[PDB]
Amino acid sequence: MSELEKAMVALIDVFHQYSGREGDKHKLKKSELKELINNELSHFLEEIKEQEVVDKVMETLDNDGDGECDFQEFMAFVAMVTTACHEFFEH
Amino acid sequence: MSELEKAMVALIDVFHQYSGREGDKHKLKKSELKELINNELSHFLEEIKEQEVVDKVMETLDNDGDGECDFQEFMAFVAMVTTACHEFFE
Numbered sequence: 372m373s374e375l376e377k378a379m380v381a382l383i384d385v386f387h388q389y390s391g392r393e394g395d396k397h398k399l400k401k402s403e404l405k406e407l408i409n410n411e412l413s414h415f416l417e418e419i420k421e422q423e424v425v426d427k428v429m430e431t432l433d434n435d436g437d438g439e440c441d442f443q444e445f446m447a448f449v450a451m452v453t454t455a456c457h458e459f460f461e462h
Numbered sequence: 463m464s465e466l467e468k469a470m471v472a473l474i475d476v477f478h479q480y481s482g483r484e485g486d487k488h489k490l491k492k493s494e495l496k497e498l499i500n501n502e503l504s505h506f507l508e509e510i511k512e513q514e515v516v517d518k519v520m521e522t523l524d525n526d527g528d529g530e531c532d533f534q535e536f537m538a539f540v541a542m543v544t545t546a547c548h549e550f551f552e
């Protein structure tokens with residue numbers, strides 16, 4: 372696959388790694404999302420060490436209001452970290 | 463670096479590859495967008511060989527109507543292809 376195709380497949384794969392852990396296998400619960408961030412974005416975001424921060428990220432990301440992060444809502448978080456990293460550097 | 467972190471980087475890196483060819487270094491014009499789809503999404507989307515298709519895709523992606531695809535707009539594109547792929551893990 373190209374460098375873009377591989378990247379797209381990795382987003383799918385990572386969302387599935389964390390979402391199939393508990394309950395709804397195709398949505399991220401608070402605990403799943405915290406592990407995803409803490410394990411998989413250590414060089415991009417501060418580790419979450421507080422409940423308040425898990426709560427807040429979920430509230431930001433939860434657009435349909437079910438209290439979970441689904442794949443659409445995950446791709447939106449991906450855009451805002453990727454944009455953050457882009458915003459960061461002068462290119 | 464994690465797989466996700468690498469995937470995020472590759473997204474910036476492929477955007478920059480194609481956006482820095484012609485004109486505005488930061489933006490994808492139609493011809494840069496068409497070569498990006500055709501060279502880098504060959505396994506996902508149909509090869510573009512019709513101007514009409516170049517135009518429709520750009521019209522679809524361009525939300526500020528400056529006729530180019532900037533980084534935010536390329537991200538919405540990424541998410542829509544990824545989703546039309548995810549529907550395959552259905």
Ligand SMILES: Clc1ccc(-c2noc([C@@H]3CCCNC3)n2)cc1
Nearest residue numbers: 416417418419424428431447448451
């Ligand atoms: Cl769309 C979006 C989603 C999440 C964030 C976000 N959620 O947390 C943080 C930082 C990372 C490390 C913990 N503190 C805040 N950023 C920003 C935009």
Ligand SMILES: Clc1ccc(-c2noc([C@@H]3CCCNC3)n2)cc1
Nearest residue numbers: 507522523538539540541542543546
């Ligand atoms: Cl923003 C965006 C991104 C990708 C598409 C797209 N590229 O191909 C398809 C079709 C429809 C969905 C599933 N089959 C391919 N859709 C449309 C808009």
Ligand SMILES: [Ca+2]
Nearest residue numbers: 390393395398
């Ligand atoms: Ca789950």
Ligand SMILES: [Ca+2]
Nearest residue numbers: 433435439441
């Ligand atoms: Ca939700």
Ligand SMILES: [Ca+2]
Nearest residue numbers: 481484486489
């Ligand atoms: Ca350009």
Ligand SMILES: [Ca+2]
Nearest residue numbers: 524530531532
């Ligand atoms: Ca634009």
